[PDB]
Motif scaffolding. Structure first.
Motif, PDB file in Angstrom:
ATOM      1  N   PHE A 340      18.835  15.070  32.473  1.00  0.00           N
ATOM      2  CA  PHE A 340      18.087  16.292  32.080  1.00  0.00           C
ATOM      3  C   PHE A 340      16.950  16.875  33.111  1.00  0.00           C
ATOM      4  N   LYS A 341      16.983  15.688  34.221  1.00  0.00           N
ATOM      5  CA  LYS A 341      15.842  16.097  35.265  1.00  0.00           C
ATOM      6  C   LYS A 341      16.649  17.260  36.281  1.00  0.00           C
ATOM      7  N   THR A 343      18.587  19.937  35.347  1.00  0.00           N
ATOM      8  CA  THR A 343      18.426  21.328  34.945  1.00  0.00           C
ATOM      9  C   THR A 343      17.099  21.780  35.216  1.00  0.00           C
ATOM     10  N   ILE A 344      16.202  20.893  35.118  1.00  0.00           N
ATOM     11  CA  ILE A 344      14.616  21.270  35.493  1.00  0.00           C
ATOM     12  C   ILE A 344      14.422  21.004  37.232  1.00  0.00           C
ATOM     13  N   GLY A 345      15.377  21.118  37.854  1.00  0.00           N
ATOM     14  CA  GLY A 345      15.048  20.768  39.022  1.00  0.00           C
ATOM     15  C   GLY A 345      14.358  19.552  39.639  1.00  0.00           C
ATOM     16  N   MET A 346      14.736  18.430  39.163  1.00  0.00           N
ATOM     17  CA  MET A 346      14.120  17.168  39.538  1.00  0.00           C
ATOM     18  C   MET A 346      15.248  16.161  39.401  1.00  0.00           C
ATOM     19  N   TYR A 373      23.866  23.047  35.793  1.00  0.00           N
ATOM     20  CA  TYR A 373      23.023  23.784  36.382  1.00  0.00           C
ATOM     21  C   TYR A 373      23.571  25.064  37.081  1.00  0.00           C
ATOM     22  N   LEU A 377      23.421  27.109  32.985  1.00  0.00           N
ATOM     23  CA  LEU A 377      22.024  27.841  33.061  1.00  0.00           C
ATOM     24  C   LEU A 377      21.923  29.261  33.383  1.00  0.00           C
ATOM     25  N   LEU A 380      23.385  31.143  30.967  1.00  0.00           N
ATOM     26  CA  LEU A 380      22.557  31.304  30.095  1.00  0.00           C
ATOM     27  C   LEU A 380      21.843  32.841  30.224  1.00  0.00           C
TER      28      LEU A 380
ATOM     29  N   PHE B  67       6.603  22.166  35.568  1.00  0.00           N
ATOM     30  CA  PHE B  67       7.922  22.292  35.200  1.00  0.00           C
ATOM     31  C   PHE B  67       8.780  23.664  35.610  1.00  0.00           C
ATOM     32  N   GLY B  70       9.652  23.976  38.821  1.00  0.00           N
ATOM     33  CA  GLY B  70      10.623  22.973  39.141  1.00  0.00           C
ATOM     34  C   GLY B  70      10.278  21.816  39.857  1.00  0.00           C
ATOM     35  N   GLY B  72       8.380  19.210  37.756  1.00  0.00           N
ATOM     36  CA  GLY B  72       7.930  18.564  36.643  1.00  0.00           C
ATOM     37  C   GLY B  72       8.536  17.084  36.455  1.00  0.00           C
ATOM     38  N   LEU B  74       8.998  14.196  34.161  1.00  0.00           N
ATOM     39  CA  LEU B  74       8.976  13.829  32.829  1.00  0.00           C
ATOM     40  C   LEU B  74       8.210  12.344  32.386  1.00  0.00           C
ATOM     41  N   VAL B  94       9.791  22.312  28.021  1.00  0.00           N
ATOM     42  CA  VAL B  94      10.688  22.766  29.035  1.00  0.00           C
ATOM     43  C   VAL B  94      12.079  23.508  28.575  1.00  0.00           C
ATOM     44  N   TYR B  98      10.906  26.932  30.155  1.00  0.00           N
ATOM     45  CA  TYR B  98      11.800  26.856  31.328  1.00  0.00           C
ATOM     46  C   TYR B  98      13.264  27.400  30.884  1.00  0.00           C
ATOM     47  N   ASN B 103      14.299  32.055  31.786  1.00  0.00           N
ATOM     48  CA  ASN B 103      15.521  32.816  32.024  1.00  0.00           C
ATOM     49  C   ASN B 103      15.507  33.974  30.783  1.00  0.00           C
TER      50      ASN B 103
END
Ligand code: 8IJ
Ligand code: POV
Ligand code: POV
Ligand code: POV
Ligand code: POV
Ligand code: POV
Ligand code: POV
Ligand code: POV
Ligand code: POV
Ligand code: POV
Ligand code: POV
Ligand code: TRD
Ligand code: NA
Lengths: 482, 113, 138
Positions: A340-341, A343-346, A373, A377, A380, B67, B70, B72, B74, B94, B98, B103
């Motif tokens: 899940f990191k 999709t949040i860019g991590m 990603y 996304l 979406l 976050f 980009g 963040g 966790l 998020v 996010y 979006n």
């Protein structure tokens, strides 16, 4: 001779049956409104002292309320903008004209059975409708219902709603300091030592009061309406989230006196819900309210469709990754959490070397961060744009219904406070009843301008000789004679 | 930034800078209300949960703004006592900020343009 | 005989009042521009030495500037592209033609009260308008 007044098994008279048969198509609407007129006009020729539209079926519903409870906007539009120019069938009119000086002409709409009436108000029947109930959102665009609510808004509800937003903000500022400044030593409940520890208890006591308050307001909403299991989860998204906030509050009280640290677990949810629930109070504002309706729709169609497929992919490749890992990120949580990191860019593409196959590990993550990603996304965003293009007017008309339910609840919350609702109208003489007596009605004025129907020898104008509100008028010895 | 004033001698850059104006006023101001409500909302819920560092409202509001850009983590604290609470609360954040609300912003801009 | 030149309490002559009454709808715009023509043409038959459009109300506003300060684009469009073909009401035209060789024809638009004029330029009244002032941008 047939009986205009007679009833069927379900109590529906002829006019009720003209409402049941309507289906919101133009040719049906063209007809039913034509035929609704004729029997309704005929019932003044024969039986001139009845008022058919006041007749209530077994379910206590009039033809107007039955048109509003059943989603019949064309019949509703007809009944509400009804103007009959014939003399002996003028009292059956409902849209009057009070003066016409040139292109300007001031119309009067009756407000019988729309305002907080006795049995079933058209606003209540529309506002408190079940969720199927077609055209819930269009039935209020029927004039004068916009202006009537916007009148109630600008006159008493706007000043009350902003006081409700304030008292909720203060409540959130107080439950937040009482939570920020919580004890971090020992078990609950916590004795008081200093003055700073006295202020918070005033903030903690006072914070539980609102939870009790928002708890009963959800019980009232339950018993004042009796919503079905369906309606409970599909259109009541506010009352769910204030009541839910209230449950985490009381659980935070049950656990603060049961000697358990899990009060914090509920207390932080009640905050996060609470601040998110200021997005409720964006409905006093047209641009922020419509914005928050779009947030609702995005969550329900775009994001729920999204998060199914995303959690399927996530849990899918997650199992495939941790299966490949050998002794740390050899867990299903830490792999689902690392995936899940992305999709949040991590996302580290090298969060393990504890595997035996590297092509397998990276083909499997590249498969993941392409289909989630890059694809899903960005897809979406594309879906949202498709959504925003469509729900622009739908979100404006869910907003006006949101604001309407606030107008009605504000009226219904203050039967005792101020006096009732300030009556949203004026008692005007539209003409004379067919028995010669006065026809006084609670009527809503709407000034209108017309640059095409210049001459229009109306006559149906009810108080022309004074041409405005001003002071009391002449009544215009034309069509009225009594 | 005020050289974007002088894009109005140019038709394509001037119209571009008018769109920047409108985006700031309708799309971004609507956005930043709801974003700051969510941010400050879950922020208080996080620092409330933290115990002794990121036991501050700034550093939590500052980490929760990482976050959207980009950046963040966790796992920017272990100084809590409940981990389901900490991550359900950030995942809630998020997703609604996010995934949803940024979006959604793009979608609103396209409607605007 | 009525006075074409007479003023009301707020100084608005008849033509000013044709501007105040406009509401940017087509049927009103179709009409007001028709009726704006006729009195404006009539004022050349009777009183042939007046120039009504130069008359200024209490606020110093002409019917053109009042159409531009109040957002009246249809009346503004009429007053500006105004071409009257009648001989004795041609000087009241405002869109002229200077030549027409085949399909080509060179029009002339007067620039009285648009350029940096004395009292109220149509560009200033449009450009320096208050923000409500409908159709600032059109
Ligand atoms: C297995 C789990 C069991 C669970 C059981 C219990 C579930 C209880 C919650 C259910 C809901 C959970 C969230 C997802 C659903 C969507 C939320 C949302 O957008 O609904 C918008 C709402 C609208 O109002 P209304 O109802 O008045 O609008 C109705 C409505 O439009 C209707 O269609 C019209 O016909 C009618 O006319 C109109 O009147 O607006 C607000 O509610 C204010 C704004 C609120 C914020 C919105 C953003 C998201 C909030 C949820 C996230 C909270 C974050 C913190 C969580 C902490 C713990 C993890
Ligand atoms: C003790 C201190 C507490 C904190 C301070 C707040 C205290 C409580 C404050 C109460 C008063 C509420 C604000 C009233 C503003 C004027 C009304 C007005 O004309 O608005 C205009 C627009 O204005 C906006 O759209 C403004 C932004 C709307 C979102 C909410 C802002 C609330 C401000 C505070 C945020 C606090 C957040 C929480 C903070 C903890 C008109 O609205 P519209 O867009 O034209 O739509 C109307 C509908 N209609 C046009 C169809 C008719
Ligand atoms: C909605 C949630 C969103 C957030 C979560 C997002 C992720 C999806 C969440 C999914 C919820 C379930 C999580 C895993 C099961 C519970 C834990 C467990 O015992 O796991 C066991 C099952 O071992 C496996 O490898 C898993 C097998 C399938 C279980 C899940 C079924 C499908 C759930 C829906 C799937 C999605 C697709 C369908 C739905 C769209 C073992 O794994 P473990 O956990 O390590 O157990 C301890 C083992 N230990 C002793 C070695 C330490
Ligand atoms: C959509 C429908 C289904 C699709 C199914 C797709 C799957 C089909 C594929 C199947 C084959 C997958 C690989 C099998 C195992 C090979 C060995 C291995 O993994 O690691 C070995 C070598 O590790 C390396 O990194 C060296 C290169 C290995 C071979 C790479 C082949 C690339 C094929 C591209 C094909 C693209 C296919 C694209 C498909 C769209 C062992 O070494 P290690 O210790 O692991 O390495 C670490 C040390 N190092 C740092 C020095 C490297
Ligand atoms: C001492 C040194 C200082 C630095 C150098 C700069 C010195 C100062 C420079 C002064 C001169 C300004 C540039 C003139 C270019 C030619 C004009 C032309 O024909 O443009 C064409 C398009 O061209 C563009 O759109 C170009 C990009 C526009 C943005 C601004 C570029 C400025 C260049 C420098 C940036 C420096 C940034 C700040 C740097 C510190 C025509 O325009 P159009 O699109 O057709 O629209 C016109 C309207 N109309 C069509 C409706 C009629
Ligand atoms: C526009 C700004 C954008 C950027 C910021 C984005 C975030 C939002 C900005 C918000 C501005 C306010 C910041 C916090 C208050 C000031 C500091 C203070 O004394 O805090 C106290 C209040 O402790 C709490 O836990 C806060 C309680 C609510 C205060 C804010 C009210 C709502 C403001 C609007 C909220 C947004 C939703 C509504 C509006 C849309 C204590 O916390 P502290 O700060 O640690 O104080 C020192 C304590 N110490 C001695 C232990 C160290
Ligand atoms: C046209 C559009 C473009 C132009 C835009 C123009 C500007 C737009 C932006 C505007 C935001 C400006 C904010 C103020 C300046 C930075 C904060 C500051 O001074 O922190 C100082 C104090 O701060 C505090 O003590 C604040 C405590 C409350 C936290 C809430 C704010 C968090 C800041 C971030 C929110 C990000 C939100 C992002 C989204 C809005 C530093 O704190 P510290 O001393 O190191 O620690 C103390 C901690 N404690 C006191 C809490 C315990
Ligand atoms: C939108 C309307 C409102 C929604 C309200 C939602 C909230 C409702 C939920 C409420 C319940 C929340 C949890 C209560 C406390 C449990 C214990 C805990 O947190 O940590 C305990 C165990 O830490 C763990 O990580 C182990 C697992 C704990 C339980 C996980 C339950 C997951 C439920 C999923 C439900 C999904 C719900 C999805 C909702 C959409 C204590 O241990 P620790 O020291 O903290 O652990 C650190 C050590 N470690 C690294 C080994 C782990
Ligand atoms: C309205 C919309 C907005 C609001 C929405 C509100 C809800 C939003 C979110 C909701 C999701 C909440 C999930 C539960 C809480 C966190 C998990 C937990 O407690 O972990 C604890 C245990 O966890 C496990 O043991 C889980 C094992 C299965 C892994 C699959 C879930 C991974 C969690 C993440 C999936 C992210 C998916 C993101 C996309 C969905 C901690 O684990 P641990 O003890 O340290 O290690 C044990 C490992 N082992 C047991 C597996 C070997
Ligand atoms: C425009 C709206 C947004 C902006 C403004 C937002 C609000 C102001 C912004 C930021 C707040 C700044 C910090 C406040 C003081 C620290 C805490 C304290 O002293 O008491 C306790 C908590 O505090 C409370 O529960 C609230 C009462 C605080 C005491 C002083 C009176 C304030 C009244 C406010 C009336 C309500 C709010 C106003 C409306 C009526 C501390 O509890 P403790 O366990 O002893 O912890 C030790 C703390 N200490 C060591 C530091 C002492
Ligand atoms: C140290 C500090 C010093 C400073 C202190 C400062 C104090 C600051 C002030 C308040 C602090 C909190 C007090 C309680 C109120 C909680 C918030 C609240 O009610 O918000 C409501 C406003 O409310 C009103 O407009 C009426 C005010 C509440 C009356 C009842 C209080 C609860 C008492 C016990 C009652 C038990 C029995 C219940 C029946 C009577 C919200 O408005 P709403 O219209 O309800 O809309 C939301 C609901 N809906 C969205 C789901 C539709
Ligand atoms: C921060 C709000 C209060 C958190 C603790 C809840 C338990 C009850 C505390 C006060 C007693 C209420 C009856
Ligand atoms: Na990043």
């Amino acid at each position: 001779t047939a009986d205009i007044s007679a009833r069927d098994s379900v109590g529906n008279t002829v006019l009720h049956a003209l409402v049941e048969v309507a289906d919101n198509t133009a040719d049906n609407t063209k007809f039913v409104t034509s035929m609704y007129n004729e029997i309704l006009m005929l019932g003044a020729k024969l039986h001139p002292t009845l008022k058919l539209e006041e007749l209530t079926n077994k379910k206590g519903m009039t033809p107007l309320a039955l048109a509003a409870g059943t989603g019949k906007i064309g019949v509703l539009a007809y009944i509400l903008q009804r103007e009959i120019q014939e003399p002996e069938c003028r009292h059956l009119s409902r849209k009057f004209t009070e003066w016409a000086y040139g292109p300007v002409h001031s119309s009067l709409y009756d407000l019988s059975c729309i305002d907080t009436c006795e049995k079933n108000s058209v606003l209540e029947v529309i506002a408190y409708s079940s969720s199927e109930t077609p055209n819930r959102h269009d039935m209020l665009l029927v004039e004068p219902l916009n202006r009537l609510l916007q009148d109630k808004w600008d006159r008493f509800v706007k000043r009350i709603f902003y006081f409700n937003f304030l008292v909720y903000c203060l409540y959130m500022i107080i439950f937040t300091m009482a939570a920020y400044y919580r004890p971090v030593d020992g078990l609950p409940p916590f004795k008081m030592e200093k003055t700073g520890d006295y202020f918070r208890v005033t903030g903690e006591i006072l914070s539980v009061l609102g939870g009790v308050y928002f708890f009963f307001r959800g019980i009232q909403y339950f018993l004042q309406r009796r919503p079905s299991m369906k309606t409970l989860f599909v259109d009541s998204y506010s009352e769910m989230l204030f009541f839910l906030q209230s449950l985490f509050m009381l659980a935070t009280v049950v656990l603060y006196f049961s000697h358990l640290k899990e009060y914090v677990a509920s207390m932080v949810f009640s905050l996060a819900l609470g601040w998110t629930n200021m997005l409720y109070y964006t409905r006093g504002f047209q641009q922020m309210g419509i914005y928050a309706v779009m947030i609702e729709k995005m969550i329900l169609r775009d994001l729920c469709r999204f998060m199914f497929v995303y959690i399927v992919f996530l849990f899918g490749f997650s199992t495939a990754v941790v299966t490949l890992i050998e002794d740390s990120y050899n867990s299903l949580y830490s792999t689902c959490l690392e995936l899940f990191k992305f999709t949040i860019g991590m996302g580290d593409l090298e969060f393990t070397e504890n595997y035996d196959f590297k092509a397998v590990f990276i083909i499997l993550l590249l498969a993941y961060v392409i289909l989630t990603y890059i694809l899903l996304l960005n897809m979406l965003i594309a879906l949202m744009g498709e959504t925003v293009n469509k729900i622009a007017q739908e979100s404006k008309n869910i907003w006006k219904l949101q604001r309407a339910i606030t107008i009605l609840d504000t009226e219904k919350s203050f039967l005792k406070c101020m006096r009732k609702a300030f009556r949203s109208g004026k008692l005007l003489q539209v003409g004379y009843t067919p028995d010669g007596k006065d026809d006084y009605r609670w009527c809503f004025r709407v000034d209108e301008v017309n640059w095409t129907t210049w001459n229009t020898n109306v006559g149906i104008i009810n108080e022309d000789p004074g041409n405005c509100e001003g002071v009391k008028r002449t009544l215009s010895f034309s069509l009225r004679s009594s």
